Amino acid sequence: VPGGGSVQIVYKPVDLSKVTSKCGSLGNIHHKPGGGQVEVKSEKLDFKDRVQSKIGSLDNITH
Amino acid sequence: VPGGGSVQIVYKPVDLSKVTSKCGSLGNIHHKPGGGQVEVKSEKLDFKDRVQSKIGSLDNITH
Amino acid sequence: VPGGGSVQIVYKPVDLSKVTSKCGSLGNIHHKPGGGQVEVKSEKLDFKDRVQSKIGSLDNITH
Amino acid sequence: VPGGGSVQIVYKPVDLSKVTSKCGSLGNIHHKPGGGQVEVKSEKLDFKDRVQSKIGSLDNITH
Amino acid sequence: VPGGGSVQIVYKPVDLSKVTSKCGSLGNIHHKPGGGQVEVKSEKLDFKDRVQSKIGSLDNITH
Amino acid sequence: VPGGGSVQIVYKPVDLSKVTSKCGSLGNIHHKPGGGQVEVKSEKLDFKDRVQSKIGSLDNITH
Amino acid sequence: VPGGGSVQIVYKPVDLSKVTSKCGSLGNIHHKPGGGQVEVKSEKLDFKDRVQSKIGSLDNITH
Amino acid sequence: VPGGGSVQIVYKPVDLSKVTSKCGSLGNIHHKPGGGQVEVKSEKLDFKDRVQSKIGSLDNITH
Amino acid sequence: VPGGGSVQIVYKPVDLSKVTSKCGSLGNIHHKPGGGQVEVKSEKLDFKDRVQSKIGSLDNITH
Amino acid sequence: VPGGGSVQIVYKPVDLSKVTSKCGSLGNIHHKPGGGQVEVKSEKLDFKDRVQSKIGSLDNITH
């Protein structure tokens, strides 16, 4: 799996309910949100700051 | 999986309900949102700031 | 999967309800929004700011 | 999947309801919006700001 | 699995309920959110800041 | 701050640039969009679905 | 701060730039978007689904 | 701070730049987006599902 | 601070830069986004599901 | 601080830079994002599911 920097975010929730009931039968089920508070963050920054300067000579007598 | 910087965000929720009831039978089910609070963030910035300057000499006597 | 910067955002929600009822049978089901609070952000900026200047010499005597 | 910068936003919601009822049977189901609060943002800016200047010499005596 | 920097975030929750009931039978089950408080963060920054300067000589007599 | 349901969305961006330049001076600045990808959503629905029915008796012999 | 349900979304970005330059001076600054990927979602739904039914008796002999 | 359910989302970014430069002086600064990937979600739903039914007696001999 | 359920989300970033430069002086500074990957989620749901049913007697001989 | 359930999320980042430079002086500083990967989640759900049923007697001879 070569490479330089790779982020993968996959979200696949699934919720199903099954209940049986025959003549004179009853049932009650509750299903909450498949997902509950879920986040994925990934930042990648690349910059180059090169400071090049050439200073000969400033002042000499009486500053 | 070569490459330089790759973000993938997939969201595929699914919610289904199944209940049986025969003559003289009753049922009640509840299904909440397939997804609940879900975010994916990914930023990638690349910049180059090169500062090049050439200063011979400023002032010399009495500044 | 080569490349430089790639964002993918897919949203495919699905909600279905199934209930049985025979002579003298009744049922009640509730289905919330397939999706609940879901966002995907991805920014990619690339700029180059090169500052090039040439300064010989400013002032010399009495500044 | 080569390339430099690629954003994909797909939205395909689906909501269906199925209920059975025979002589002397009744049912009631509720279906909320297939989608609930969903956004996708992606910006890509690329600019180059090169500042080139040539300054010989300003002033010399008595500034 | 060679490479320089690689982050993977996969989220696949699943919730199902099964209950039996025959003539004169009833059941009640509760299912909470498949996921509960789950986050994945990963940042990778790479920058080079080289400061190069050449200073001959400043002042000499009476500073 | 009493009340039942209240959404407020205010957007007031501001961008200004200031640069100095004297005889033999030059400058260059760049300003991007004050706002960058910004949305506010808020929905509030309230409905009541009451199902009332009265079934005496259906069939009796040989169904 | 009493009340039942209250959402507030305020967005006020500000970007300013200041640079000095005297005879034989130059500067270059860059300003990105005051805001970068920012969303606020808030939904509030309230409904009541009461199912009331009265079934005397269905069938009796030979179903 | 009494009340039942209250969400507050405030976004106020600010970015400023200040640089000095005298005769024979130069500077370069960079400012990124005041905000970078920022979202606020908050949903509040309240519903009541009461199932009331009265079943006398179904069938009796030979089902 | 009494009350039943209260969420507060405040976002106030600030970025400033200050640099000095005199005749024959230069500087370069970089400022990244005040905010970097920041989210706040909070959901509050309250519902009541009461299932009330009355079943006398189903079948008796030969089921 | 009485009350039943209370979540508070405050985000206030601040980044500043200060550098001195006199005739024949130069400096370079770098400032990363005030915030780096920061999330706050808090969910509070309250529901009551009471199942009440009355079954006299089903079948008796030959099931």
From Swiss-Prot, chains A, B, C, D, E, F, G, H, I, J:
Positions carrying Phosphoserine: 6, 25, 53, 57
Record PTM: Phosphorylation at serine and threonine residues in S-P or T-P motifs by proline-directed protein kinases (PDPK1, CDK1, CDK5, GSK3, MAPK) (only 2-3 sites per protein in interphase, seven-fold increase in mitosis, and in the form associated with paired helical filaments (PHF-tau)), and at serine residues in K-X-G-S motifs by MAP/microtubule affinity-regulating kinase (MARK1, MARK2, MARK3 or MARK4), causing detachment from microtubules, and their disassembly. Phosphorylation decreases with age. Polyubiquitinated. Requires functional TRAF6 and may provoke SQSTM1-dependent degradation by the proteasome. PHF-tau can be modified by three different forms of polyubiquitination. 'Lys-48'-linked polyubiquitination is the major form, 'Lys-6'-linked and 'Lys-11'-linked polyubiquitination also occur.
UniProt Tau/MAP repeat ranges: 7-37, 38-63
Effect of residue 6 to N: In FTD1; minimal parkinsonism; very early age of onset
Tissue expr: Expressed in neurons. Isoform PNS-tau is expressed in the peripheral nervous system while the others are expressed in the central nervous system.
Cellular compartment(s): Cytoplasm, Cytosol; Cell membrane; Cytoplasm, Cytoskeleton; Cell projection, Axon
Site (Not glycated) residue list: 12, 18, 22, 32, 41, 44
Glycosylation sites: 48, 54
Residues with PTM N6-acetyllysine: 12, 18, 22, 32, 44, 48
Residue positions where Omega-N-methylarginine is found in the record: 50
Record cross-link Glycyl lysine isopeptide (Lys-Gly) (interchain with G-Cter in ubiquitin), residues: 12, 18, 22, 32, 44, 48, 54
Domain notes: The tau/MAP repeat binds to tubulin. Type I isoforms contain 3 repeats while type II isoforms contain 4 repeats.
Annotated disorder: In Alzheimer disease, the neuronal cytoskeleton in the brain is progressively disrupted and replaced by tangles of paired helical filaments (PHF) and straight filaments, mainly composed of hyperphosphorylated forms of TAU (PHF-TAU or AD P-TAU). O-GlcNAcylation is greatly reduced in Alzheimer disease brain cerebral cortex leading to an increase in TAU/MAPT phosphorylations. Frontotemporal dementia 1: A form of dementia characterized by pathologic finding of frontotemporal lobar degeneration, presenile dementia with behavioral changes, deterioration of cognitive capacities and loss of memory. In some cases, parkinsonian symptoms are prominent. Neuropathological changes include frontotemporal atrophy often associated with atrophy of the basal ganglia, substantia nigra, amygdala. In most cases, protein tau deposits are found in glial cells and/or neurons.
Subunit structure: Interacts with MARK1, MARK2, MARK3 and MARK4. Interacts with PSMC2 through SQSTM1. Interacts with SQSTM1 when polyubiquitinated. Interacts with FKBP4. Binds to CSNK1D. Interacts with SGK1. Interacts with PIN1. Interacts with LRRK2. Interacts with LRP1, leading to endocytosis; this interaction is reduced in the presence of LRPAP1/RAP.
Task performed by this protein: Promotes microtubule assembly and stability, and might be involved in the establishment and maintenance of neuronal polarity. The C-terminus binds axonal microtubules while the N-terminus binds neural plasma membrane components, suggesting that tau functions as a linker protein between both. Axonal polarity is predetermined by TAU/MAPT localization (in the neuronal cell) in the domain of the cell body defined by the centrosome. The short isoforms allow plasticity of the cytoskeleton whereas the longer isoforms may preferentially play a role in its stabilization.
UniProt-recorded name of the protein: Microtubule-associated protein tau
Natural source organism: Homo sapiens
Lineage start: Eukaryota, Metazoa, Chordata, Craniata, Vertebrata
Name of the encoding gene: MAPT
First-to-last residue of the parent protein present: 617 to 679 of 758
